[PDB]
Amino acid sequence: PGEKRADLIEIGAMERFGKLDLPKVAFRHDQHTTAVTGMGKDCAACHKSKDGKMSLKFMRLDDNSAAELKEIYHANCIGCHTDLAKAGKKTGPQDGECRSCHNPKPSAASSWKEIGFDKSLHYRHVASKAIKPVGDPQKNCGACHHVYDEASKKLVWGKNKEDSCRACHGEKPVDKRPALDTAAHTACISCHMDVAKTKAETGPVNCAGCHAPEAQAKFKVVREVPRLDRGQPDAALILPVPGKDAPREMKGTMKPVAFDHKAHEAKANDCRTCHHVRIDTCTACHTVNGTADSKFVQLEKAMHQPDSMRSCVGCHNTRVQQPTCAGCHGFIKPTKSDAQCGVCHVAAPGFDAKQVEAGALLNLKAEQRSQVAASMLSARPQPKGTFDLNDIPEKVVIGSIAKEYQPSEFPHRKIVKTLIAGIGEDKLAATFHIEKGTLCQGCHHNSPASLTPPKCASCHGKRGDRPGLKAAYHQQCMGCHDRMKIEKPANTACVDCHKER
Ligand code: HEC
Ligand code: HEC
Ligand code: HEC
Ligand code: HEC
Ligand code: HEC
Ligand code: HEC
Ligand code: HEC
Ligand code: HEC
Ligand code: HEC
Ligand code: HEC
Ligand code: HEC
Ligand code: HEC
Ligand code: HEC
Ligand code: HEC
C-alpha cells in the first residue's frame, strides 16, 4: 500500500503459453525510463525497432515461445541490474532475488487515468505548426487520421471521414486493426518523440505524463476553439429508418425531427459524447427495429433515454438539474404533452403524409435533408415567453389556514422575476416553455397554463395520494429553496415566512 503510480505494468506475457509457476512481475515504467535516461541511454535499451516502427514489446519483435520469453526477460532485466550493482549504482533485483521481481504483494497502488482529446486538446494539435499539412495546402488531419481504402489496399487519409480512434480500435486487436491501447501508444508517443527532437513544443512521453491526474491537471487549455471542419451538417433531419427486413411494426409513427447540429456542436465538449461508437447517423445502428450493431437498442431509446447523456431528453434532463431550473423541475411531473412531443416532432414542409409513407424523406440526399431541416428549424414558433408580470399579484397573502402563525406574506412577482432572471438566455427553457404560463406551472402544477390559477386548497387538504395543505406549502416552498440553494429564508426559521401570533 505505497504511493499511487500511473506507470504500472504487470509482466505476464508468458501466461499465453500456459500456467505460470511464479507471480507476474510488477514493473514501474517511468521509474525505469528515468533511470535509463540518466544512464545516458533511451528507449532502444529495451525496445527493438522494425522499419522505423518501435516495438512496444520488451527486447523482441514477436513472442516466439515460452522459453524464448523467459530467456529474453531474465537475460535483459537482470543483465542491466547486475551491471548497475557492479558499479555501486542504484539498481533492481538481482539474480537470486526471485520474489523481488515475482512479487505477489507489490506495494504501489494505481493512480492511472484514461486520457482523451478535449475540444481544446484536439485544437492544440490541429493548430500546431509542428504538425505539417499532408494531402492539402492547409489541413493536417491526414497526419493522424485514416480510413482503410478498399481500392488502395492501404490506409489513406479519408477526407471528411475522421473519427475517434475508439471508433475502429477497440479492446483487442481485430484483424489488422491494433487495439486502442496499441494504436495510441504507437501513434501519439512516436510523434511526440519526433517533435521533441526538433525542440518545439511537444506532448508527453512518460506514462504519468499522459495517465496521471496531476499531469492532466497541468495540460494547457485553449478556450477560443473554432468549429471543427469535418463537413458535418448544420441542420439534421433525423428519420425513423425502419431497418433491413424490419416488419411493418417498425415503420415511422411520429413526425420527423429537425436538429440544430451547429448549435449543439458548440455546446458539447466533443463529438464522441453523442457519436459514441461512430460518427454516422444514429440510424445506421439505432433503426426503429434495432440492429446487432446497436445491441438492439431501438431508435426511441437512443433519443429519449432519461438518464443517458447520449439521448436528447437524457442530456436535456441533466441541464434541468442545475440549481437554476431544479426549483421547478425537481417538483413537477412531466405532462408528456402532445404539444411537448411537438417541440422536436415537427412536420416536414414540402412532403405531406402521403409521400412520407413510401420514403420521400428517407431517400433524400444529405444536402436535401439539410434544407428540409433548415426549414423546420427557422419555422418553429417564436419563443412564447410569459405573461406580463404586472398581470400577476405582486405579493400574495397565504392565510387560509393561519392558526399557530400569522398569514404568510409571499413575494409572488419578485420570485417569478428572479426565476426568469436565473434562466435568462437558456435555449432549452426558451423553446420548451411552450406556453405563456408554463413557467407558472412551476408551482401551479396539474392545471392549465393560465393567468388565473386555482388555489392550492382547491386540491390539497380535505384519497391519500397528495399532501394536506400545510405539508404541500412546506414541501413546495422549502423544496425549491433547497434545490436552488436559496439560504434566503432558512427552512429552519419558522418566523421568516410567517410571524408568531
Ligand atoms: C526481475 C529482474 C526478475 C528476477 C530477479 C527473476 N525473474 Fe523470473 N521472470 C521475470 C520476468 C519479467 C518474467 C516473464 C514473466 C511472465 O509471466 O511473462 C520471468 C519469468 C519467469 C518464469 C516463467 C514464468 C512463470 O512460470 O511464472 C519463471 C519460472 C521464473 N521467471 C523464475 C525465476 C526464478 C526462479 C528466479 C530466481 C532465481 C527469477 N525468476 C528471477 C523477471 C525476473
Ligand atoms: C527497459 C528498462 C525499458 C525502457 C528503457 C523503455 N521501456 Fe517501454 N516497456 C518496457 C517493458 C518491460 C514493457 C512491457 C511489455 C513487455 O514486453 O514486457 C514496456 C512497454 C511499453 C509500452 C506499453 C505500455 C502498456 O500498455 O502497458 C509503451 C507505450 C512503451 N513501453 C514505451 C516506451 C518508450 C516511449 C520508451 C523510451 C522513452 C520506453 N518504453 C523505454 C521496458 C522499457
Ligand atoms: C537498465 C537498463 C535496466 C533494465 C533493462 C531493467 N531495469 Fe529494473 N531497475 C533498474 C534500475 C536503475 C532500478 C532502480 C530504480 C530506482 O530508482 O531505484 C530498477 C528497479 C527495478 C525493480 C524494483 C522497483 C522498486 O519497487 O524499487 C524491479 C521490480 C525491476 N527493476 C524489474 C525489472 C524488470 C522486470 C526488467 C525487465 C523487463 C527490468 N527491471 C529491466 C534498471 C533496469
Ligand atoms: C499519451 C501520449 C500516452 C502515453 C505517454 C502513454 N499512454 Fe497509455 N494510453 C494512452 C491512450 C490514448 C490509451 C487508450 C485509452 C485511453 O486512455 O484513451 C492508453 C491506454 C493504456 C492502457 C489501457 C488498458 C485498458 O484497459 O484499456 C494502459 C494499461 C496504458 N495505456 C499504460 C501506459 C503505460 C504503462 C505507459 C508508459 C510506458 C503509457 N500508457 C504511455 C496514452 C498514453
Ligand atoms: C493528431 C495530432 C490529430 C490531428 C492532426 C487531427 N486529429 Fe482528429 N483526433 C485525433 C485523436 C487522437 C482523436 C481521438 C479523441 C479521443 O479522445 O478519442 C481525434 C478525434 C477526432 C474526431 C472525433 C471527435 C471526438 O469526439 O473525439 C474528429 C471528428 C476529428 N478528430 C477530426 C479531425 C479533423 C477534421 C482534423 C483536421 C483539421 C483533425 N481531426 C486533426 C487526432 C488528430
Ligand atoms: C476507422 C475508420 C479508423 C479510425 C477512426 C482510426 N483508424 Fe487506425 N486503422 C484502421 C484500420 C482499418 C487499420 C489497419 C490497416 C490495415 O493494415 O489493414 C488501422 C491501423 C492503425 C495502426 C496500425 C499501424 C500503422 O501502420 O499505422 C495504427 C497505429 C492506427 N491505426 C492508429 C490510429 C489512431 C491513433 C487513430 C485515431 C486518431 C486511428 N487509428 C483511427 C482504421 C481506423
Ligand atoms: C504528431 C503528429 C502527434 C500525434 C500523433 C499526437 N500528438 Fe500530442 N502533441 C503533438 C504536438 C506537436 C504537441 C504540442 C502542442 C502545442 O501545445 O503546441 C502535442 C501536445 C500534446 C499534449 C499536451 C501536453 C501538455 O500541454 O503538457 C497532450 C496531452 C498530447 N499531445 C497527447 C497526445 C495523445 C494522447 C495522442 C494520441 C491519442 C497524441 N497526443 C497524438 C503531437 C502529436
Ligand atoms: C427532442 C428532445 C424530442 C422530444 C421532446 C421527443 N422526441 Fe421522440 N424522437 C426524437 C428524435 C430525434 C427521434 C428520431 C427521429 C424520428 O423522428 O424517429 C425520435 C423518435 C421517436 C420515436 C421512434 C420513431 C417512431 O416511432 O416514429 C418515437 C416512438 C417517438 N419519438 C415518440 C415520442 C413521443 C411519444 C414523445 C413525447 C412524449 C417524444 N417522442 C418526444 C426526439 C424527441
Ligand atoms: C450531440 C449533441 C451531438 C454532437 C456533440 C455532435 N453530433 Fe453529429 N449528429 C448528432 C445527431 C443527433 C445527428 C443526426 C443523426 C441522424 O441519425 O440523422 C448527427 C449527425 C451528424 C453527421 C451526419 C451523419 C449522416 O447523416 O451521414 C455528421 C457527419 C456528424 N454528425 C458529425 C459530427 C461531428 C464531426 C461532431 C463534432 C465536431 C458532431 N457530429 C457532434 C449528434 C451530435
Ligand atoms: C452503431 C454503430 C451505433 C451508432 C451509429 C450509434 N450508437 Fe448508440 N448504441 C450502440 C451500442 C453498441 C449501444 C449499447 C452499448 C453502448 O454503447 O452503451 C447503444 C446504445 C445507445 C443508447 C442507450 C442508452 C444507454 O444505456 O447509454 C443511447 C441513448 C444511444 N445509443 C444513443 C445514440 C445516439 C444519439 C447516436 C447518434 C449520434 C448513436 N447512439 C449512435 C451503437 C450505436
Ligand atoms: C419554474 C418557474 C421553471 C423554471 C425555473 C424552469 N422551468 Fe422548465 N418547465 C417548467 C414547467 C412547468 C414545464 C412543463 C413540464 C411538462 O412536462 O410539460 C417546463 C418544461 C421544460 C422542458 C420540457 C419537458 C422536460 O424535459 O421536462 C424543458 C426541456 C425545460 N423546461 C427546460 C428548462 C431549463 C433548462 C431550465 C433552466 C434554465 C428551466 N426549464 C427552468 C417550469 C420551469
Ligand atoms: C412558485 C414559485 C410560483 C410561481 C413561479 C408562480 N406562482 Fe402564482 N402563486 C404561488 C403560490 C404558492 C400562490 C398562493 C396560492 C394559494 O393557494 O395559497 C400563488 C398565487 C397566485 C394567484 C392568486 C391565487 C388566488 O387566490 O387565486 C395567481 C392569480 C397566480 N398565483 C398566478 C400566477 C401566474 C400567472 C404565474 C406565472 C407567471 C405564477 N402565479 C407564478 C406560487 C407561484
Ligand atoms: C389540482 C388541480 C391541484 C392543484 C391546484 C395543486 N395541486 Fe399539488 N398535487 C395535486 C396532485 C394530483 C398531486 C400528486 C401528483 C403530482 O402531480 O405530483 C400533487 C402533488 C403535490 C405535492 C407533492 C409532490 C411530490 O413529489 O410528492 C406538493 C408539495 C404539492 N402538490 C403542492 C401544491 C401547492 C403548493 C399547490 C399550490 C400552488 C398545489 N400543489 C396545487 C393536485 C393539485
Ligand atoms: C417558508 C419557506 C416557510 C417556512 C420557513 C416555514 N413555513 Fe410554515 N408554512 C408556510 C406557508 C406558506 C404556510 C401556509 C400559511 C397559511 O396560513 O396559509 C405554512 C403553514 C404552517 C402551519 C399551518 C398554519 C398555521 O398554523 O398558522 C404551521 C403550524 C407551520 N407552518 C409551522 C412551521 C414551522 C414550525 C416552521 C419552522 C420550523 C415553518 N412553518 C417554516 C411556509 C413556511
Rounded Cα distance, 141 and 193, in Å: 19
Question: Do the beta carbons of residue 439 and residue 386 sit within 8 Å?
Answer: yes
3 state DSSP class of 449: coil
Distance 302 CA to ligand 10 centre (A): 6
- Name which residue sits closest to atom 17 of ligand 5, judged by CA: 116
483 CA distance to ligand 14 centroid (A)? 19
Asked if residues 376 and 349 have their Cβ atoms less than 8 Å apart, the reply is yes
Q: Is the C-alpha dihedral spanning 160, 162, 168, 173 positive or negative?
A: positive
Residue ID of nearest Cα to ligand 14 atom 6: 494
What ligand 8 atom has the least distance to the C-alpha of 338?
A: 37
The β-bridge partners of 177 are 174
CA distance 402 to 499: 10
Under 8 Å between Cβ of 242 and 252: yes
Which ligand number lies closest to the CA of residue 486? 14
Terminal Cα-to-Cα distance of the chain (whole angstroms): 63
E strand segments, 32-94? 49-50, 53-54
- φ/ψ of 405, rounded to 5, equals -130, 165
Range 247-251, long-range pairs (CB < 8 A, 24+ positions): 247/289, 250/287, 250/288, 250/289, 251/288, 251/357
Question: Can you tell me the distance from the alpha carbon of 273 to that of 278, in angstroms, rounded to the nearest whole number?
Answer: 11
Q: What number of CA atoms fall less than 13 Å from residue 242's CA on the CB side?
A: 17
Query: In one letter, which amino acid is 304?
Result: H
Ordered DSSP codes for 376-398:
HHTTSPP------GGGS-SSEEE
Spell out the residues 6+ positions from residue 319 whose beta carbon is closer than 8 angstroms to its own: 325, 428
Cell of 172: 483487442
Atom 33, ligand 1: which residue's CA is nearest? 98
Taking CA atoms, 261 is separated from 126, 164, 238, 267, 319, in Å, by 22, 18, 11, 10, 18
Which cell numbers hold the place of 149? 481504402
The amino acid present at 455, given as its one-letter code, is K
Number of H helices, E strands in the chain: 17, 12
| Alpha carbon separation from 343 to 300, 335, 380 (Å, rounded) | 16, 13, 8
Burial environment of residue 276 by CB neighbours within 10 A (0 to 12, 13 to 18, 19 or more): middle
Helix ranges (H only) for 206-278 are 207-211, 213-216, 261-267
Query: Which atom from ligand 1 is nearest to the alpha carbon of 78?
Result: 2
Strand partners, 154: 149
Instruction: Please give the annotated binding residues, written as ranges.
Output: 29, 32, 43, 46-47, 74, 77, 80-81, 98, 101-102, 122, 125, 141, 144-146, 165, 168-169, 185, 188, 191-192, 207, 210-211, 261, 264, 271, 274-276, 282, 285-286, 304, 312, 315-316, 325, 328-329, 341, 344-345, 412, 433, 440, 443-445, 456, 459-460, 474, 477, 480-481, 494, 497-498
Q: What is the DSSP string of 286-304?
A: --SS--GGGTT--HHHHHH
What sign does the CA torsion over 384, 386, 387, 390 have? Answer: negative
Residue ID of nearest Cα to ligand 9 atom 39: 271
What grid cell was written down for 85? Answer: 550493482
Decide: 84 and 90 in contact? Cβ < 8 Å.
Answer: yes
State if residue 432 touches ligand 11 by the CB under 6 angstroms criterion: yes
Q: Longest C-alpha distance within the chain, in Å?
A: 93
- Length of the chain (residues): 501
Method for structure elucidation: X-ray
Q: Which ligand is nearest to the Cα of residue 210, counting in written order? A: 4
Is residue 124 a contact partner of residue 200, using CB atoms and an 8 Å limit?
no
Question: Which stretches of 337-489 are DSSP H helices?
Answer: 338-344, 366-377, 412-423, 427-432, 469-483
Q: Which residue's CA is the nearest one to ligand 9's atom 32?
A: 232
- Check if 186 has its Cβ closer than 6 Å to any atom of ligand 6: yes
List the beta strands (DSSP E) in 151-226. 154-156
Indicate the SS3 state at residue 266: helix
What's the 180 CA to ligand 6 centre distance in angstroms? 9
Question: Cβ distance 373 to 236 under 8 Å?
Answer: yes
Ligand 6 contact via 276 beta carbon (within 6 Å): no
Q: Compute φ and ψ for 81, nearest 5 degrees.
A: -60, -40
Distance between CA atoms of 431 and 41, rounded to whole angstroms?
62
Residue 425 has what DSSP assignment? T
Domains identified in the chain and CATH numbers: 1-111 (3.90.10.10), 112-221 (3.90.10.10), 233-383 (3.90.10.10), 384-501 (3.90.10.10)
Q: Which residue, among 449, 239, 243, 422, has the nearest Cα to 344 in the 3D structure?
A: 239
What Å distances lie between residue 314 and 52, 109, 259, 296, CA to CA?
A: 47, 35, 15, 19
